[PDB]
């Protein structure tokens, strides 16, 4: 009871960023590492270690 | 002994 | 075929592991797994003569019985695991009328569970001796705990054990019918309840399981072999 | 004693002010990923019973699988060879982890014990290095921060950081009110996020021992939880049939990935290396790729005969393994 | 501890027959495939035979093929080499070597002490320098050359380095060209180019003195080099 | 002047009978072969023998029936020595394979009903029995293919089996008797015993016991069919030893067209059974 109040206090103190910002950065991470991703961008069969 | 009247059946 | 001396040796190691896994498969396939669901005071610990795991053998067939008392509350999370058991062995204390309605709710939760939708239940009303003593003594009326009992009449099909007072027979079949009513209501034939009256003294409960698991597998085999 | 309700609305209004826009309006101009067709490249057929857990090695060639028959098998995915087969004391094993070093693997289940196995002994056998006891409920998940530290979740509603050599719990996380079903370590390893049957996901601090942020979007048990590669967002699967991206810094849900046809629960959730694709295993016997930014289904890994219990993406991001109750683990490139 | 003591060797008249028995203690003998390697008294190492785990694959060196047969009693943890038609060339110390083969495994990791026998298309490993004088704190580069590229398509270069300190059994230093064996100091390093390889011993210590053998495992017969001594 | 030529009106009546047989059989067997393989749910170790049975029967329906039909029509071999050997080998083995496959599914059914708890045959063993069946069938049919010969009589070309010349024809008598015992008497004994023990158990909820009775009906039909349909087949091939004069007559042509028809008609029954007893097969049949 009192412990739950103490936890709620800390969780409410947390500084927060605007979702227009946080969404932008995750969008940015995806674009920056897009070439790296071998599933979003299909890998050449030779490179594919699972080519079989 | 193949005969002209003999019938030949196959399993 | 284009495999190095070390690749070939690794393939051999894999094949050796595969043979051990095949020997294990035979033991696993031969073992019929049973989930001993129940509550404290059921006597589920001593239904079979032989706490989480107990292994018996009837007619050279080995059965593994798992009692998961370690985790409580919603059992939904851990029941998903036992969706391949041949048959749940539910055990109910007939004597405890107060906890009997609690027992009928667990059966309803287990019978209607998403994962246990094809698993047949081998219900074992235990402590039938206690129930007989209470009915003869009086004091505790099954009518008080359950109002429907006064209307109830012994089923005509019911076969009574020798000398059992008609009221004792009526009581025993009232308890059984409550568990059966839940089973009949929500079943597509995918699974069935096998109700068996048992006592602590009875040592034939392992044989009962044998005969009922033979029917579950039979009905499954009939459909599996495209016969029914 | 009801100041807690006052604090609860204060947290809600702080999140409401922060959510000026939706992730979907921000990424509405981003051009979609396009249908993603992934064919099965490898089928690993070594387990007798249903597969409940799989983990990928750092090398992205070795992978450890758990089965309800009671065995852990390490697989050389590239050659489909079985490197090691570990017999386990308890037939019921609900989780399996692979150490980042590769020196050890762990497994846990209804036993309520997390067993760490030394893969590299001089004797050449795999032996149990340590058995960790203290969880009063099944160990749903375990992940190794390092060779001497493991973070294990439990049905006792508590997660715990254990020093393997001592065998003792360095820290215990007791905030959840429901069985913790999954845990994901952040890339930094400083913070882990765990999803419970209380329909709540809590971010913790491994060093401090406290719940930094509580996220409450789902309507039912959070079956799975994955961290976005950046380590600032996480994605949770639930029986609600909905996957929900959260952002740790915004402290609120960014997006939801639900389809009207999809009504079965999500057993597992993973992200590709770029974090663009949110793979998710469903009890419909198939996994569904989702464009994380656009919230659009972009593909389906339909090759399983029963519930897909686990899904993992290689570190490199080259492949996605998918365990299932059919007893076949399939690699999808 | 891990031990592979072998006995069964002594003086034998030519055309005789002796059985050599390696008793394994402290490891799962069944899991590890075993090999017999011999060192003629004034010469280098030569691979005699290989018994795979499960006894399902046996390979022999052309010199001893037919005359020598290798068996394993997995229950008794014992390796046997029934040698028949013994010739004077057979005289040598025979070492039983354990080898486990899984991805990431180190084959040839443990060698037994050795049993002495006194009788009254092969890839070629060329260690050019028979000897190299060295004083402590220097870096040497023992080099081996190979008739064929030991690099397989898999990307693995099956070249192994072993150090037989004076009076001691050979010890794995480097496995698969670059990987360093466990218990092996960090000073050693393996650098290779498919056909030509080099072992670099930095900050050489008095422990390092001994003969260094390069072996190939790309295919059988396994072939060792002549060896390169490093004298203080 | 070949006496085995028949009027166009006779040929048409025989063609219609054989047409019904051939088309129905392959359609059903092919669909049964497909249902099992197309649906992973229907693709189980249990249905390995059923797909094997469907294959061999479609094979004899298309191979043994169509080819033998023209040969009975004018007793002329329009296929040549090569196809003569081919027909006395694979089509005849397909007949043996179907009868042995029927003995495998019977064993499976017997174990799965009489001893339900005992685990099913291992997938590997199931695959070993499929091969053993086909292997023994090819082995039994080998002598008939080995001595295959196409004598070109002035009247017609005829594919005949030149068994080793013996005064008492001991070799061809032993071969035809062993065939009758191994593919008729021995199967009639193991399929008949298994179905009896299974049917006695199953026969002894109205809908559920009605099913365990419908299965018993199918089983009595299968035992009776395999006995009634195949007996004339064997009698025809063991009669040139009992009475060689009958083969020299003309009516023997029509007799052959009948005995084969009755024996090959067995192929059509297996798909119809799977549809009547199993819903997943009738639904599958419309699905294709
Ligand atoms: C010329 C003769 C030998 C031809 C014989 C063909 C036989 C051997 C073939 C034809 C169809 C085949 C079956 C077709 C499909 C399947 C399902 C698969 O999951 C296991 C093998 C199995 C069950 C095959 C077994 C072998 C089989 C029965």
Q: How far apart are CA D99 and CA D132, in angstroms?
A: 16
Instruction: Specify the DSSP element, H or E, that contains C143.
Output: helix C142-145
E195: which 2 tokens?
């056909």
F245: which 2 tokens?
């004069």
F286: which 2 tokens?
């419309």
**B9 at interface of F, judged by CB pairs closer than 8 A:** yes
- For chain F, the first-to-last Cα distance in angstroms comes to 49
**F158 at interface of B, judged by CB pairs closer than 8 A:** yes
Best residue in C32, C86, C157, C228 for a mutation probing chain F (most F CBs within 10 Å): C228
- ω into E54 cis (within 30 of 0): no
**B1 at interface of F, judged by CB pairs closer than 8 A:** no
E25: which 2 tokens?
């203690």
- Strand pairing report for D71-76 and D81-87: antiparallel
Q: How far apart are CA D179 and CA C11, in angstroms?
A: 42
Report the residue of chain B nearest F148, measured CA to CA: B10
**Residues paired with D155 in a beta bridge:** none
Give the ligand 1 atom nearest the CA of F43: 19
How many CA atoms are closer than 13 Å to the CA of D4, on its beta-carbon side? 10
- A27, D175: Cβ pair inside 8 Å? no
Neighbours of D67 (CB within 10 A): 24
Q: How far apart are CA D132 and CA D115, in angstroms?
A: 6
**Residues paired with E3 in a beta bridge:** E25
Query: Which chain E residues are closer than 8 Å to C9 by Cβ?
Result: 33, 52, 57, 99, 101
| DSSP codes joined into one string, F102-151 | HHHHHHHHHHHHHSSSSPPPPHHHHHHHHHHHHHHHHHHHHHHHHTEEEE
Q: Which fold has domain E3-119?
A: Immunoglobulin-like (2.60.40)
Q: How far apart are CA F178 and CA F186, in angstroms?
A: 10
Q: How far apart are CA D95 and CA E43, in angstroms?
A: 55
Neighbours of E116 (CB within 10 A): 13
Q: What is the CATH number of the domain that holds C203?
A: 3.40.50.300
Class of domain D2-332: mainly beta
Q: What backbone phi and psi angles, to 5 degrees, belong to F266?
A: -60, -35
Report the residue of chain E nearest C15, measured CA to CA: E54
Q: What backbone phi and psi angles, to 5 degrees, belong to C200?
A: -65, -40
D267 alpha carbon – ligand 1 mean position (Å)? 37
Domain with CATH 2.60.40.10 in chain E: 3-119, 125-225
Query: Which chain C residues are closer than 8 Å to D83 by Cβ?
Result: 10, 13-14
**D264 at interface of C, judged by CB pairs closer than 8 A:** no
What's the domain count of chain C? 1
Instruction: Identify the residue whose tokens are 């069935």.
Output: C192
How many CA atoms are closer than 13 Å to the CA of F118, on its beta-carbon side? 12
The boundaries of the domain holding residue C162 are 5-225
Q: What is the resolution of this structure in A?
A: 2.7
DSSP symbol at E224: B
Rg of chain E taking only CA atoms, in angstroms: 17
Q: How far apart are CA D45 and CA C3, in angstroms?
A: 21
E12: closest CA of chain C, how far (Å): 34
Q: How far apart are CA F215 and CA F12, in angstroms?
A: 37
Q: Is F176 annotated as a binding residue?
A: yes
Residues E231, E51 contacting (CB under 8 angstroms): no
E101: closest CA of chain C, how far (Å): 5
The size of the C-E interface in CB pairs under 8 A is 43
Residues D49, D283 contacting (CB under 8 angstroms): no
Show the domains of chain F with their CATH numbers: 8-287 (1.20.1070.10)
Query: Which chain D residues are closer than 8 Å to A25 by Cβ?
Result: 230, 232
**Residues paired with D321 in a beta bridge:** D312, D331
> SS3 string of chain D?
CCHHHHHHHHHHHHHHHHCCCCHHHHCCCCCCCCCCCCCEEEEECCCCCCEEEEEECCCCCEEEEEECCCEEEEEECCCCEEEEEEECCCCCCCEEEECCCCCEEEEECCCCEEEEEECCCCCCCCEEEEEEECCCCCCCEEEEEECCEEEEECCCCCEEEEECCCCEEEEEECCCCCCEEEEEECCCCCCEEEEECCCCEEEECCCCCCEEEEECCCCCCEEEEEECCCCCEEEEEECCCCEEEEECCCCEEEEEECCCCCCCCEEEEEECCCCCEEEEEECCCEEEEEECCCCEEEEEECCCCCCEEEEEECCCCCCEEEEECCCCEEEEC
- Strand pairing report for D329-332 and D320-324: antiparallel
Option in A12, A23, A26 nearest D11 (CB): A12
Residues E115, E9 contacting (CB under 8 angstroms): yes
Q: How far apart are CA C71 and CA D52, in angstroms?
A: 18
Instruction: Identify the residue whose tokens are 């419909």.
Output: D284
D306 alpha carbon – ligand 1 mean position (Å)? 26
Query: Which chain C residues are closer than 8 Å to E107 by Cβ?
Result: 6
Q: Which residues contact C140 (CB under 8 A, 6 or more apart)?
A: C97, C134
- Residues of C (64-123) whose Cβ lies below 8 Å from D: 66, 68, 70-71, 74, 77-78, 81, 83-84
Rg of chain B taking only CA atoms, in angstroms: 8
The CATH number assigned to the domain with range E125-225 reads 2.60.40.10
Q: How far apart are CA C152 and CA C173, in angstroms?
A: 9
Query: Which chain D residues are closer than 8 Å to E103 by Cβ?
Result: 61-62, 76, 79, 81, 83
Q: How far apart are CA D103 and CA D119, in angstroms?
A: 6
Give the ligand 1 atom nearest the CA of F138: 3
Residues E9, E94 contacting (CB under 8 angstroms): yes
**Which residue's CA lies nearest to atom 9 of ligand 1?**
F52
**F151 at interface of B, judged by CB pairs closer than 8 A:** yes
What crossing angle do the helices spanning F266-277 and F48-60 adopt, rounded to 10°? 140
Instruction: Specify the DSSP element, H or E, that contains F156.
Output: none
Could you state, in order of their start, the residue ranges of all structural domains in chain D? 2-332
Instruction: Identify the residue whose tokens are 């000026």.
Output: D20
Q: How far is CA E113 from its chain centroid? A: 12
Q: How far is CA D322 from its chain centroid? A: 12
Torsion of CA F232, F233, F234, F236, to 10 degrees: 80
D129: which 2 tokens?
């290095």
In the three-class reduction of DSSP (H, G, I as helix; E, B as strand; rest coil), residue F286 is classed as helix
| DSSP codes joined into one string, E156-191 | -B-EEEEEE-TTS--EEEEETTTEEPTT--TT--EE
Q: How far is CA E207 from its chain centroid? A: 19
How many CA atoms are closer than 13 Å to the CA of C154, on its beta-carbon side? 15
Q: How far apart are CA C118 and CA C138, in angstroms?
A: 40
Residue F41 burial by Cβ neighbours in a 10 Å radius (0-12, 13-18, 19+)? exposed
- Sheet bearing D329-332, strands edge to edge: D40-44, D329-332, D320-324, D308-313
D127: which 2 tokens?
């032996």
- D61, E103: Cβ pair inside 8 Å? yes
F55 alpha carbon – ligand 1 mean position (Å)? 8
Q: What backbone phi and psi angles, to 5 degrees, belong to C103?
A: -65, -40
| Chains F and E touch, using 3 or more CB pairs below 8 Å | no
Q: Which residues contact C73 (CB under 8 A, 6 or more apart)?
A: none
Give the ligand 1 atom nearest the CA of F93: 2
Q: Chains meeting F at 3+ CB pairs closer than 8 A?
A: B, C
Neighbours of F170 (CB within 10 A): 11
Q: How far apart are CA D139 and CA D194, in angstroms?
A: 13
Q: Which residues contact C72 (CB under 8 A, 6 or more apart)?
A: none
Q: How far apart are CA D312 and CA D315, in angstroms?
A: 9
**C8 at interface of E, judged by CB pairs closer than 8 A:** yes
CA-to-CA separations, F190 to F14, F109, F186, in angstroms, rounded: 34, 12, 6
Q: Tell which one of F37, F39, F42, F55 to mutate to probe ligand 1, the residue whose CB is within 8 A of the most ligand atoms.
A: F55
């Amino acid at each position: 009871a009192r412990k739950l109040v103490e936890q709620l206090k800390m969780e409410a103190n947390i500084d927060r960023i605007k979702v227009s910002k946080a969404a932008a950065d995750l969008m940015a991470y995806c674009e920056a590492h897009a070439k790296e991703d071998p599933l979003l961008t299909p890998v050449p069969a030779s490179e594919n270690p699972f080519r079989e | 002994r193949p005969k002209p009247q003999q019938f030949f059946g196959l399993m | 075929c284009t495999l190095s001396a070390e690749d070939k040796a690794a393939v051999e190691r894999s094949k050796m592991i595969e043979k051990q896994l095949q020997k294990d498969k035979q033991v696993y396939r031969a073992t019929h797994r049973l989930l001993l669901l129940g509550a404290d005071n059921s006597g589920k610990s001593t239904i079979v003569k032989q706490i989480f795991e107990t292994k018996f053998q009837v007619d050279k067939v080995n059965f593994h019985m798992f009692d998961v008392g370690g985790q409580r509350d919603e059992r939904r999370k851990w029941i998903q695991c036992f969706n391949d058991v041949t048959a749940i062995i539910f055990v109910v204390d007939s004597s405890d009328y107060n906890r009997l309605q609690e027992a009928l709710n667990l059966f309803k939760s287990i019978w209607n569970n998403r994962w246990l939708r094809t698993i047949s239940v081998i219900l074992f009303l235990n402590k039938q001796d206690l129930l007989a003593e209470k009915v003869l003594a009086g004091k505790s009326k099954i009518e008080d705990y359950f109002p429907e009992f006064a209307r109830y009449t012994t089923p005509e099909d019911a076969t009574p054990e020798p000398g059992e007072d008609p009221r004792v027979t009526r009581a025993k079949y009232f308890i059984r019918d409550e568990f059966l009513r839940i089973s009949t209501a929500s079943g597509d034939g995918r699974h069935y309840c096998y109700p068996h009256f048992t006592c602590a003294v009875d040592t034939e409960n392992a044989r009962r399981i044998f005969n009922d698991c033979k029917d579950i597998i039979l009905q499954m085999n009939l459909r599996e072999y495209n016969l029914v | 004693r009801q100041e807690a309700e006052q604090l609860k609305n204060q947290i809600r209004d702080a999140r409401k002010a922060c959510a000026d826009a939706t992730l979907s309006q921000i990424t509405n101009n981003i051009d979609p990923v396009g249908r993603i067709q992934m064919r099965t490249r490898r089928t690993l057929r070594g387990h007798l019973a249903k597969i409940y857990a799989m983990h990928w090695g750092t090398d992205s060639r070795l992978l450890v699988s758990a089965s309800q028959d009671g065995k852990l098998i390490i697989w050389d995915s590239y050659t489909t060879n079985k490197v090691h087969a570990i017999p386990l004391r308890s037939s019921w094993v609900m989780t399996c982890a692979y150490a980042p070093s590769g020196n050890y693997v762990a497994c846990g289940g209804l036993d309520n014990i997390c067993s760490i196995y030394n893969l590299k002994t001089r004797e050449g056998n795999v032996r149990v290095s340590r058995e960790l006891a203290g969880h009063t409920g099944y160990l749903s998940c375990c992940r190794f921060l390092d060779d001497n530290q493991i973070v294990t979740s439990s049905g006792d509603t508590t997660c715990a950081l254990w020093d393997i050599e001592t065998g003792q719990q360095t820290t215990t996380f007791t905030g959840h009110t429901g069985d913790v079903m999954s845990l994901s370590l952040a890339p930094d390893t400083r913070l882990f996020v765990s999803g419970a049957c209380d329909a709540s996901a809590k971010l913790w601090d491994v060093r401090e021992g406290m719940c930094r942020q509580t996220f409450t979007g789902h309507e039912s048990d959070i079956n799975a939880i994955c961290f976005f590669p950046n380590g600032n967002a996480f994605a949770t699967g639930s029986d609600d049939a909905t996957c929900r991206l959260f952002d740790l810094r915004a402290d609120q849900e960014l997006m939801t990935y639900s389809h009207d046809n999809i009504i079965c629960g999500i057993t597992s959730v993973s992200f590709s290396k770029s974090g663009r694709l949110l793979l998710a295993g469903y009890d419909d016997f198939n996994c569904n790729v989702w464009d994380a930014l656009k919230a659009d289904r972009a593909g389906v890994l339909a090759g399983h005969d029963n519930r897909v219990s686990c899904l993992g993406v290689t570190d490199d991001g080259m492949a996605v393994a998918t365990g299932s109750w059919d007893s076949f683990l399939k690699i999808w490139n | 501890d891990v031990q592979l003591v072998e006995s069964g060797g002594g003086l034998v008249q030519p055309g005789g027959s002796r059985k050599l028995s390696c008793s394994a203690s402290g490891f799962a003998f069944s899991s590890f495939g075993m090999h017999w390697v011999r060192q003629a008294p004034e010469k280098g190492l030569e691979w005699v035979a290989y018994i795979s785990s499960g006894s399902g694959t046996i390979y022999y060196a052309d010199t001893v093929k037919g005359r020598f047969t290798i068996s394993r009693d997995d229950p008794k943890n014992t390796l046997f080499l029934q040698m028949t038609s013994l010739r004077s060339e057979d005289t040598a110390m025979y070492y039983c070597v354990r080898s486990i083969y899984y991805y990431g495994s180190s084959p040839f990791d443990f060698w037994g002490q050795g049993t002495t026998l006194t009788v009254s298309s092969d890839i070629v490993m060329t260690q050019a320098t028979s000897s190299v004088p060295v004083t402590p704190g220097e870096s040497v580069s023992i080099s081996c050359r190979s008739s064929k590229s030991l690099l397989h398509s898999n990307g693995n270069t099956y070249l192994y380095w072993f150090l037989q300190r004076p009076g001691q059994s050979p010890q794995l230093l480097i496995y698969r060209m670059s990987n360093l064996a466990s218990g092996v100091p960090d000073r050693f390093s393996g650098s290779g180019s498919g056909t030509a390889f080099t072992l670099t011993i930095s900050r050489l210590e008095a422990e390092d003195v001994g003969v260094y053998y390069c072996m190939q495992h790309l295919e059988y017969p396994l072939t060792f080099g002549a060896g390169t001594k490093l004298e203080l | 002047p070949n006496q085995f030529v028949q009027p166009a009106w006779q040929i048409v009546l025989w063609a219609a009978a054989y047409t019904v047989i051939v088309v129905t059989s392959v359609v059903g067997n092919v669909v049964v072969m497909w249902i099992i393989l197309a649906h992973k749910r229907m693709r189980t170790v249990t249905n390995y023998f059923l797909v094997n049975l469907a294959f061999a029967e479609a094979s004899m329906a298309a191979f043994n029936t169509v080819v033998n039909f023209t040969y009975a029509v004018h007793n002329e071999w329009y296929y040549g020595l090569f196809y003569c050997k081919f027909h006395n080998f694979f089509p005849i083995a397909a007949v043996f394979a179907s009868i042995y496959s029927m003995t495998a599914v019977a064993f499976d059914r017997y174990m799965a009903i009489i001893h339900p708890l005992q685990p099913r045959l291992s997938a590997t063993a199931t695959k070993v029995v499929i091969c053993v069946i086909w292997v023994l069938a090819l082995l039994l049919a080998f002598p008939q293919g080995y001595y295959s010969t196409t004598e070109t009589m002035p009247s017609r070309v005829v594919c005949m089996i030149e068994w080793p010349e013996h005064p008492n024809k001991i070799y061809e008598k032993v071969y035809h008797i062993c065939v009758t015992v191994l593919i008729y008497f021995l199967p009639l004994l193991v399929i008949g015993y298994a179905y009896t023990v299974v049917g006695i158990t199953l026969w002894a909820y109205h809908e559920q016991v009605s099913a365990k009775r419908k299965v018993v009906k199918m089983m009595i039909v299968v035992v009776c069919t395999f006995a009634i349909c195949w007996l004339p087949f064997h009698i025809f091939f063991l009669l040139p030893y009992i009475n060689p004069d009958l083969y020299l007559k003309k009516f023997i042509q029509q007799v052959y067209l009948a005995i084969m028809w009755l024996a090959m008609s067995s192929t059509m029954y297996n798909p119809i059974i799977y549809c009547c007893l199993n819903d997943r097969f009738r639904l599958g049949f419309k699905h294709a």
